[PDB]
Design a protein around this ligand. Structure first.
Ligand SMILES: [Cl-]
Lengths: 76, 76
């Protein structure tokens, strides 16, 4: 399952993304889109992607930075 | 490989996206992010994602609508 994560702080590392999203399930892959301040996060299960989306979408979880956006992508 | 495709015409279907990106390689999956007018497209090979990124730059698509933006997502 794919999450598009955006409005990340400039220079957020894949390891920081991995820590943030590992709280909700098994992260299979992270692809970085640094010129967009964004990333793609893949979970093993849709149930985990849903929980992380609900938990983190439009949340300023990084201090002194704006709210991170988290959108669940619809396959097919 | 994973491409993040943005600036889609509003309402663009996954069938239309599949048809466009099939011009450059075997499309493995498409995930729609339609509230963002965006999509994630995965190719079987990296060469195809590069070809697609380069060929689509400034190219009118979907009945001569505005070009789309294509960014190659780096795995980690
Ligand atoms: Cl999972």
């Amino acid at each position: 399952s794919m999450l598009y994560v955006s409005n990340l702080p400039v220079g957020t590392s894949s390891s920081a993304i991995h820590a943030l999203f590992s709280a909700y399930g098994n992260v299979k892959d992270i692809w970085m889109l640094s010129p967009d301040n964004s990333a793609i996060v893949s979970y093993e299960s849709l149930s985990s992607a849903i929980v992380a989306r609900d938990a983190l979408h439009n949340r300023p979880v990084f201090e002194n930075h704006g709210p991170v956006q988290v959108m669940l992508a619809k396959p097919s």
